[PDB]
Amino acid sequence: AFITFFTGTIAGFALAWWMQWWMGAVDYPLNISGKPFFALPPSVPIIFELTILFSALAGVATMLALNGLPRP
């Protein structure tokens, strides 16, 4: 299920990176400090870190799915 961790990183990565190409420039932009509209660096600790959450939980949704652990 690292091959199932595939979809964890991509969607979260795409989520943040889509949470800014949709947000920082195209829909309600702002000249906050001349920041050039979702230039990579201040997006990295979200395009990195928010990926970790949505990619870890899928990493554990697998864990709760291998022979479906919730079978008390």
Partner: protein, 382 residues
Amino acid sequence: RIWAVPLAIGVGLLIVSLVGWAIDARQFYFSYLVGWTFCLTLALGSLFFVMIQHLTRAQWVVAVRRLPEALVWTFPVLIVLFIPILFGLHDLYHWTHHELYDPSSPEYDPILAGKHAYLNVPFFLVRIAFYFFIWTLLAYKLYTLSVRQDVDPDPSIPAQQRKVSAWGMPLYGVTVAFASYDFLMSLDPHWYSTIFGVYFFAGSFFVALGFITTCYAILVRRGTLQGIVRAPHFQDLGKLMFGFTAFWAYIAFSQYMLIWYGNLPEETLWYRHRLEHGWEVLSQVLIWGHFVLPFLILLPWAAKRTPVLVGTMGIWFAIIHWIDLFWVAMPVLHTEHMTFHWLDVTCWLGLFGVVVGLFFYRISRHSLVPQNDPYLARSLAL
């Protein structure tokens, strides 16, 4: 022989690169720095590998222990290779010019009461010649020891190596910081950054993990061994190459997002390096080629531990430090014209051969794997 081919081809090439010190003069001194400090980072990185192997002691990666120790005694040879800097030292750091503090020049660069105590080129002599009394002393106190627990086994075998790690440990991390603050901080001294003492450190211990790793990966295939050092040894080296690629890119990016934000005068490292003059090319193709291709390719544990890949990575993982460090050392000259010269590379393949010349000649001088050692078969029978 195995020892003289990287040496004769590299010193054959280094003696050829005397042409640099003679012709296109100021170019070669600083292609020598990017090469010289790489050999130093190789010394610096793989030594810290030995240290951390002893502090939180690790009997699991010990077949890959004796060989770093060989790498260290380079740095005494790296002393006599400090010479080409010194003739060009008055031409490089821009504070050695001494026509600037309060002489008749139009410039009173604010260096008079601030820096002139820390930097005065006879002080620079001792600020590094002092380090030769430490980073070599580790060699003459560690390499003399760890080679010697084989033939003359001690009652207290490791705990003398620990003694180096008990008081010879912290001075290392200090002298690495001040070294970087003395060598590579100073090319564009209109810059003040506290992290960069670690970017040199981590960017060293980043690399040398790879060179130690690829050596076995080379010396496992058609080497003196082929199956002794098992696969899950390298499985840890991957876990290290990730855990220290993080400790690099965390640093190479904390140097970036922090300075990409504020836009201060200290930024002028990168108004000249990053964007302009054929180096936005460098940084992009660097970071795509320096963090993500390693962090992506090595990741899955179905070929992460294979020898020949991680050996193939040690090439892409250490040849790239040229591209990492050529983004620091040389650009203050070719700030006008990004035209990297042939002399930029002769010293890379030179010193990366010359260091390895000595590195095999010492492994020719004596053993390879410690003939007796604590927990050896515990790591071999693994």
